[model samples]
Target: NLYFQGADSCIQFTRHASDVLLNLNRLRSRDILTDVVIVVSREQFRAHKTVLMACSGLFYSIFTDQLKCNLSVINLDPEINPEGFCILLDFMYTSRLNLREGNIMAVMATAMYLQMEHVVDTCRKFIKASE
Candidate 1:
């Protein structure tokens, strides 16, 4: 049997996912990271709804700000939910994000809402990429 197949595959997948979860939990528990879920309300989120057309819908809902308002963010970093926001905040603080196809729109919306200019600009590049 292939070493990476069957039970081994399941084991490896679980390990990988667990590692990711561990890192996420660490960030979530740390005050150094964002403490909320980071979702803006539909009313505020709708401001950038136009940009949704430029992106695949899979990532659209995660984008918090569409209007580039910089004030519409709900600051889920202080609340509780998926816990991924803490990791995302850490990522924002530490490195430049790639904002690839799967997560670009959402990240862009987040950066815009958080007033993260560099990330917002990076997200704007997605518009160019889509074209």
Candidate 2:
């Protein structure tokens, strides 16, 4: 007779995702070993391409294009505030959507513009929950 044991698993399916996000958040917060730079409204913010590409398909396409520059400058329309871009950057790094009364609308609009459906959905849910 032959017997086999299944492999041991420590982290739950979703737990691994959360753990990865947490580590990415720490990396971003500490400003450690970041690879890419995003410039918005003439202000620069450091980030990792892996995180950004994983979070946003638009970013994935843009970053993976022929232009492999580590730095990217974004000049969004006036309707899209730079502050909203900052919040999206935070979301990209931490997987946490922080929407305040002052910035929620702007952030939502920017999220839609960036084609980040998750951010848009999160913003919508947050608004619905607040009401």
Candidate 3:
């Protein structure tokens, strides 16, 4: 090959392209700059408001509603699966999801409850493709 210096000037980019979201997750893990708290099974999960608004329509609705303006904490439905909901929350930050027989139903159910159609679609496709 031809002689190259400093690795061809390098491509200046973010998270290999998903840079912004990757960093958002990093901050979320540290619980830094998190603006809202989600309560599942009385457990708390702190996250950014804008990220939730951007990711889930149901979340966007709840946060934007005209009631109380007490957008600090969110209490999910009692029937919702806490484990599945936690996975979804992390996925919102990490930008990925994994579905398998063990947790698939809970995840899909919670994904539907949250009106996360993309996740529902993803959940369906993974199961469909499995057969």
Candidate 4:
């Protein structure tokens, strides 16, 4: 376990993703992390910007202020599906997710909408039944 770390410009540090995943729920209950929330008309989902950035490229672009908009919450066109958004939240918090009969179509709709290429591939494989 001995590496190069003598405090002479050769130090090192690292952390595991497991801790971050577990803390999502812990932090969410507190509601002290992000000032942003997803507004789906009357419905809403509060989430971490970190998870959103990690998950979607479209969000990644906006979150990084590519357009330099000073907005807090994101209001969708109401074409937004609450189920699809929920599925995204599930996938973001959990390391892995699935495409089921009920939510599969909606998930892809949201997935591609957000330009999350990674998730769309997962959706397609499920259609093939992944033998």
Which candidate leads in lDDT? 3
Clashing pairs in 4: none
In terms of lDDT, model 4 sits at 0.76
Which candidate would rank higher by lDDT, 2 or 3? Answer: 3
lDDT of 4 by residue, 15-64 (tens): 34566686885687677686678887688888877788888887788788
Clashes of each: 10, 0, 1, 0
Model 3 lDDT-worst window of ten:
1-10
True lDDT of residue 109, candidate 1 = 63
Q: Which residues of candidate 1, in runs, are more than 4 Å off?
A: 1-87
**How much is the lDDT of residue 44 in candidate 1?**
19
Candidate 2, 67: how far from true, in Å? 2.2
What's the TM-score of every candidate structure? 0.36, 0.72, 0.80, 0.77
lDDT of candidate 3 over 27-101, digit per residue (tens): 998989998898888678898888888888889888788882357888888888888988898888777786668
Off by over 4 Å in 4: 1-15, 66-69
Instruction: Report lDDT (CA) for all predictions.
Output: 0.44, 0.77, 0.83, 0.76
Scored against the true structure, residue 31 in model 4 reaches a CA lDDT of 79
- Estimate the overall C-alpha local distance difference test score of candidate 3: 0.83
Best by TM-score: 3
